[PDB]
Amino acid sequence: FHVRVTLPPRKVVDRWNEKRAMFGVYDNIGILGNFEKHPKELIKGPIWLRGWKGNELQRCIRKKRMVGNRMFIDDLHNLNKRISYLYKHFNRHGKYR
Amino acid sequence: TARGTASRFLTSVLHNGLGRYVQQLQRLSFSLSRDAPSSRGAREFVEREVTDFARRNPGVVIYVNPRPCCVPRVVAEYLNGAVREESIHCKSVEEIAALVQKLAD
Amino acid sequence: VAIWQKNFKRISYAKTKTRAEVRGGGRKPWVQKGSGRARHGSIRSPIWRGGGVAHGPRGPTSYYYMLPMKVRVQGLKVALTVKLAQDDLHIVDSLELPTADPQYLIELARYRRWGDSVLLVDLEHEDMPQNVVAATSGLKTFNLVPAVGLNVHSMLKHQTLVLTLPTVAFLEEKLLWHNSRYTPLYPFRLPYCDFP
Amino acid sequence: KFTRSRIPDKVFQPSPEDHEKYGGDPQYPHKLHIVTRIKSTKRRPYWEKDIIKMLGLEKAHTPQVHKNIPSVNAKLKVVKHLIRIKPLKLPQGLPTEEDMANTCLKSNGELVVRWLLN
Amino acid sequence: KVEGDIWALQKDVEDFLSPLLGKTPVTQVNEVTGTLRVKGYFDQQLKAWLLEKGF
Amino acid sequence: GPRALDLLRALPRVSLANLKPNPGSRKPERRPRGRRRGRKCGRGHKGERQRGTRPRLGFEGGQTPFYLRIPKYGFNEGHSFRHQYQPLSLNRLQYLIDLGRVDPTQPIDLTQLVNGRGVTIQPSKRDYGVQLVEEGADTFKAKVNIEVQMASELAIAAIEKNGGVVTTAFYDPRSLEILCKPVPFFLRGQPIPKRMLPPEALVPYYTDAKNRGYLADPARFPEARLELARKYGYVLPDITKDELFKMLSTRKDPRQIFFGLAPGWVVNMADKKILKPTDENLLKYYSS
Amino acid sequence: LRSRVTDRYWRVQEVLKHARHFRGRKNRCYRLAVRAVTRAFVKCTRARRLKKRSLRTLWINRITAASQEHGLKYPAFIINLIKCQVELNRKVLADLAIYEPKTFKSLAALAKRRREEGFAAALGDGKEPDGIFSRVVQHR
Amino acid sequence: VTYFSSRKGKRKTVKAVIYRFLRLHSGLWLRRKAGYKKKLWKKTAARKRRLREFVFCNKTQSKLLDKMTTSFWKRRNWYADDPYQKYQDRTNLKV
RNA sequence: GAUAGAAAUUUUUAUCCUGACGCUAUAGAGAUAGUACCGUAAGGGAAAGAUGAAAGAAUAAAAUAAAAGUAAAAAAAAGCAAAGAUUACCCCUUCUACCUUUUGCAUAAUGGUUUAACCAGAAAAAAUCUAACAAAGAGAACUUUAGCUAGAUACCCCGAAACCAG
RNA sequence: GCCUAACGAGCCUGGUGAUAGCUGGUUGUCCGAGAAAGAAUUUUAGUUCAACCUUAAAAAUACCCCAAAAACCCUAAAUUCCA
RNA sequence: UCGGAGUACAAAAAACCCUCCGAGUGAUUUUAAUCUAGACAAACCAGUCAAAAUAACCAUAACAUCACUUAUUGAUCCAAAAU
Ligand SMILES: [Mg+2]
Ligand SMILES: [Mg+2]
Ligand SMILES: [Mg+2]
Ligand SMILES: [Mg+2]
Ligand SMILES: [Mg+2]
Ligand SMILES: [Mg+2]
Ligand SMILES: [Mg+2]
Ligand SMILES: [Mg+2]
Ligand SMILES: [Mg+2]
Ligand SMILES: [Mg+2]
Ligand SMILES: [Mg+2]
Ligand SMILES: [Mg+2]
Ligand SMILES: [Mg+2]
Ligand SMILES: [Mg+2]
Ligand SMILES: [Mg+2]
Ligand SMILES: [Mg+2]
Ligand SMILES: [Mg+2]
Ligand SMILES: [Mg+2]
Ligand SMILES: [Mg+2]
Ligand SMILES: [Mg+2]
Ligand SMILES: [Mg+2]
Ligand SMILES: [Mg+2]
Ligand SMILES: [Mg+2]
Ligand SMILES: [Mg+2]
Ligand SMILES: [Mg+2]
Ligand SMILES: [Mg+2]
Ligand SMILES: [Mg+2]
Ligand SMILES: [Mg+2]
Ligand SMILES: [Mg+2]
Ligand SMILES: [Mg+2]
Ligand SMILES: [Mg+2]
Ligand SMILES: [Mg+2]
Ligand SMILES: [Mg+2]
Ligand SMILES: [Mg+2]
Ligand SMILES: [Mg+2]
Ligand SMILES: [Mg+2]
Ligand SMILES: [Mg+2]
Ligand SMILES: [Mg+2]
Ligand SMILES: [Mg+2]
Ligand SMILES: [Mg+2]
Ligand SMILES: [Mg+2]
Ligand SMILES: [Mg+2]
Ligand SMILES: [Mg+2]
Fold first, then answer.
1. Which CATH number fits domain C1-196: 3.30.160.20, 2.60.40.10, 1.10.760.10, 3.40.1370.10?
2. What DSSP line would sit under D73-92, residue for residue?
3. Which residue of A has its CA nearest to G12?
4. Which domain of life is it from (chain D) (predicted)?
5. For an engineered disulfide with C159, which of B48, C115, F226, H45 has Cβ 3.0 to 4.6 Å away?
6. Closest protein CA to C1' of nucleotide I30, residue
């Protein structure tokens, strides 16, 4: 349970760096922008996750549908097994029925 | 636990209250932050109460230090040589008042 | 709305391997009975050292949701209201600056007691006067932004709000338009009778 | 089966000596009861537990006052082994509204109206 | 959508409803929401009463 | 206005540092840690339930399930093919006219009702259109030219009495879809399709003057229309002598979706132009 | 986001400090120590209740001694002191017995007197005599 | 019941329910009596009638059937000519 | 029955702004490595690093001395090892380890030498709560006889003998 | 019997996080209330319904209960029902 | 599996590889309709009564009867029938 004996270098975060100061700037782009672009368009990330959300099962299911054929073998296989496991679990196990 | 800790017989310092009563609290030192939220209560206390408190108890010296700290403390110090530390961190004005009184008695 | 602005963008890429995705341990490490010790299937089970993680984060995960329009609108209105009621809103005309030296801007905000940070809102992106762009490009606390980039988070991050006059004329209309509006039949980007 | 229990009325016909003995008046019944819960309801049937609740007898060795009317006497009859009943007495008579603060109840079962003058 | 002293409106609403139920109606005032909330279905009579006052 | 504002001068800046969700908004979640929520963690003891395996929903423990001992009976039988007419009361129609959502001046058809959001149609659910019901008959004072897909005698009478005209028209599913949401159809870049006929079941409905059917013989119309006035005891106005009469007689072709457009045209909305086929075959097809 | 418990040290110390004075491995190993400490606290509160009985029994023993010295058993001494409307709890009575042997002999004398009075009254079989110390005073 | 389907990730309906019950919009479910077509010659006229009825399910069953059935089956339907349209709303229910 | 499950028909606006409310040596890749080692073979498969600007500054200089285990310092009637206490360590008095499992455990029923680090409750149909707007609400597709939309509240870990393909 | 130290059918990898109504385990503090079994069931080592119970919410009577009242041969302690 | 008596003495309920009798239908003609207030019973499924109102028949005409009458019975699906 031994705890480090030396004070860590104090990390100084400047809150006024570019990325922090400009944060959430275009979030209202639809309302103020005479709706053309929905705020979804501002989402950077995985192709299957842009402007969408779901529990792990739905997530995997969707990843497979979208990018499934671009996947590496091991990863596709793992994805399938994951799906089968989650399917079995959510549908057949739990307290609440 | 009783076997676990020390113990003492009931006593007074210098037969207090026999001849005359001497308030044993000698000095009181506050340390707080002008800016930090945790010291908010302590600040109010310094505004309203401290002054009045100091008149009620002419025999205790009260030092107040604004300094950049995260955890406001009050250090009681007694004729006895004893020094008692306390944390006034994140408390009301009312609570600090009560505490300081305990220290006074 | 502040919380919404913070989270709805967020995608956590944090993943951890379930016992299934760890490298080995398809086989029973010793026989079920007689060895004298505890029973196990794969050496990659979450109990074991190198083993998989029992629950842990899974996949890139999106937190995404949409506060209903009228709410986000109410958000902006309220932010402006509050900025005004607390004396920290300043309607400016122009935005023409006498010079491109940022020190000018800093000391200006010092003279008017504007606080540490300032958010300057202008009508359109291309139409911003060059003196301002110069001055504000080298500044940390002062931030120049077009009207369509106004938002609750930025307004609460900066101590003082500075609006151009046509900007006010703009916001006023855009925001007010929602009190009188029907619910959309189809998306507003498509042709409507009165609407652009 | 263990059940509730009838208590034949012959029990409650008092003998002439009893008046002398417990100090009641042969002519006039007393108006009020002081009931106290002497025993515990644990280990007794639920119906007695309930009676004790509805008589306000929940707490032990605390006095409580009840009318001497038959409606009440029925319940008291049910739990009579759990309680002590003593007739309330008023030597100084009933309290007026000036005497409300000074009232006290003495163990002999009598209510004294003026308590601790000067 | 109540802009003003809501407490006034509470007074007037319970004074208006009281002769109906024989008793002061239960109420909740949300001052921040600008909202009044009443136990029971009074909707018709309240619409009429707010009309009469010209809102 | 909002006296709250006046307090906001007194208090410190609203900033990101001090923000409270409305109390009661977030019921805090609880985790199986500690003495209370740990040690069997709400799952009970052994059995099938603590292990997570209790059977599926309808399963009664092996006795023949309740939902399966009851006999099958057509209730929902062929439900997907039943026709569904979204009701519109005269009460709501009047309320709509009064607030000037729909205007009685020009002819009122489905698209007008949709655009006022007085009604909502979802063809996907086999909505075949609006039906007119008599709920507000006694109170209904407006004078309208209305086109719905079904109507009740009393509703019709109630409109006639005020000197208007009711007509029942039919739309097929595709037609209906286009009719309710025209602007998304025009962005589709397709011609305007023919309006289909009613199927054999609905023909006797739309061929009767009783219903003021759009396929009915106009020779019968004034007769039945008068018959209504006999039955409900009101003097039938002469629609002919009215000033808005030109608008009141306005029909659609049985093969036509809109007013003043025609099957086979194409609406170019960026140029604000219409495009029409000059071809013989196309014009024969669309006009048949 | 992996979270580990950094301060586990102090968590442990808040248990172990109570265990220092134990014998054996109970005073070191958090497992054994946690158990022993919990038993210590329980034992302690139960004893908090018991302590009062112990002390009262002590006092009664002491009073018994001090009375037996004067040729008076304990029950006699105590109830006949009550019958004088002298209410002195047993704590105080014991302390008198130790640090005030005279006053205590007085009390014993009182009690013996009151007892003899009681016998005399029970034997006499009449209402007339009221022993001097047998008179019952009311509050004023 | 399938709580999360495989393809769509949605929640399936158990059709075996849809065939034998009928959901009014109020939340009441309606069912035929059991054995109403079975062995009729052997039964009383009275009993035959008791069987020919359409009857309502108790709360427990209603919640069960609801869980076994998706949202689509609970929508407000307007059918032309529908026998049951009369019965969809509830009236004068003081609870 | 468990369950399985379409389509017609619909929608989808460029390119740059790429990184991280991901891990930091029992974690993150198995990985310093598919190496050592173990298998006849297919195959299985590790552990391990920490000085400083400079060690071309080792009579070497510098900040923890805090786990169990020991040593400094063996023990002294009597008892789940403590607690009440006490001038006083014991001596006196009072308490039948803890988990699990059970009708019921000091039980001579289960489990653990000890220490450190790892090691186990996850889902939003209906509901409740908070808020928007309200005969309508939702940034399209739906739902509506006060509803609709949004948010928040929820359902574990290890283990067989087997079975099938190569 | 033997087929590379365990052959009523080898070993290894994959299917595989096989499946266990069966055993074991399930991690901060404090507070409010709080449960012993009627029915079906290849079911009695389990489930799903009741009855109890918990959390909210609407109400109005709720226990306790004197007469009167409840079977025909004989029949007790007592029940039922109620101001 | 279903019923009667005792166990279970007087509202109901009430177990045993407890004590005793039975049922898995006959015989007969009075061939015993439709619809609906309100109830009994009840975990659910199943069971039970039943006024008024229609229609049948004397022209104001609805309990099939007997055998201890109580029990003489079997869900969904699916098959055969065509109403
Ligand atoms: Mg594997
Ligand atoms: Mg294997
Ligand atoms: Mg062993
Ligand atoms: Mg295994
Ligand atoms: Mg790992
Ligand atoms: Mg949870
Ligand atoms: Mg628990
Ligand atoms: Mg534990
Ligand atoms: Mg267990
Ligand atoms: Mg069990
Ligand atoms: Mg609809
Ligand atoms: Mg006490
Ligand atoms: Mg089956
Ligand atoms: Mg590693
Ligand atoms: Mg490794
Ligand atoms: Mg050590
Ligand atoms: Mg000892
Ligand atoms: Mg046993
Ligand atoms: Mg148990
Ligand atoms: Mg024991
Ligand atoms: Mg034993
Ligand atoms: Mg032993
Ligand atoms: Mg044992
Ligand atoms: Mg054993
Ligand atoms: Mg043991
Ligand atoms: Mg065991
Ligand atoms: Mg065992
Ligand atoms: Mg154990
Ligand atoms: Mg062992
Ligand atoms: Mg929901
Ligand atoms: Mg929970
Ligand atoms: Mg097989
Ligand atoms: Mg098998
Ligand atoms: Mg071998
Ligand atoms: Mg398992
Ligand atoms: Mg079992
Ligand atoms: Mg209990
Ligand atoms: Mg079976
Ligand atoms: Mg239940
Ligand atoms: Mg009676
Ligand atoms: Mg009553
Ligand atoms: Mg009943
Ligand atoms: Mg009749």
1. 3.40.1370.10
2. HHHHHHHTTSEEEEE-B-TT
3. A1
4. Eukaryota
5. C115
6. C23
